[PDB]
Each structure stands twice: as C-alpha cells, then as structure tokens.
C-alpha cells in the first residue's frame, strides 16, 4: 500500500505552482489529490517548493509535534504555503474549501532511511 513518504507528497506537495492561482485551487488540488475521495478532508496546506527544500527540513530545527512526538522539525527558511479549509457550504461528494496563501516556516515529522517527511504538523 501507499508509503507514508509517498502520501506525504500527494497530500501536501505542489512543486508545480509557486502559490495558488485564484480561489478555486483548493477545490481543485484537493479533489485531484484525491482528499474528497471518501470523506472530505477538514484541513490540508500545500507546499509550493521543490520537493528535496521540503526533505530537507528533516535535518533542520528539532521541536516536539503537536501530538508530542520528538520527530518533528521546523524549516529554517519561510516558505509558499497554500492552506485550504472546508467552507461552511462544504458537504459530500461537494467538498468544498477556502483557499488563503501564506509565507510561513513548515514542522514535519520525518520517519525512515531516507529521513523524511511522513506527515505536516503546522505552518508558523
């Protein structure tokens, strides 16, 4: 099944845009990144930079994640960070999200060999 670096990257990695286009993105990533599938997904942050800057964040500033892990690391650099979150209209199949652009550090947790990225914990 899907590794969690490889969910990582279809959950949360844009290296094809620098930031979100119009209001629509969010509505159109998260349903071809397939988060609408099953349920709609509440939250998501896409990263517009190159997947190995994001990687890297592995080996960057320690900090416990919000859940207390010790595996979590902020970006030293801000980044272009897209976030969507579900409208107040938003109900299945019709998921349906606000989509806000923002220049901020990233925290993910990093598992494996290669180390890196698993999950996105925040944008700060």
């Not at 979150?85 to 998921?95: D, V």
């Amino acid at each position: 099944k899907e590794t969690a670096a490889a969910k990582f990257e279809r959950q949360h990695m844009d290296s094809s845009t620098s930031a979100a286009s119009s209001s629509n993105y969010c509505n159109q990533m998260m349903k071809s990144r397939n988060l609408t599938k099953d349920r709609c997904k509440p939250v998501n942050t896409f990263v517009h930079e190159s997947l190995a800057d994001v990687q890297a964040v592995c080996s960057q500033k320690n900090v416990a994640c919000k859940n207390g892990q010790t595996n979590c690391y902020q970006s030293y650099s801000t980044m272009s960070i897209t976030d969507c979150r579900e409208t107040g209209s938003s109900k299945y199949p019709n998921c349906a999200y606000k989509t806000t652009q923002a220049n901020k550090h990233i925290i993910v947790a990093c598992e494996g060999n290669p180390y890196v990225p698993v999950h996105f914990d925040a944008s700060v």
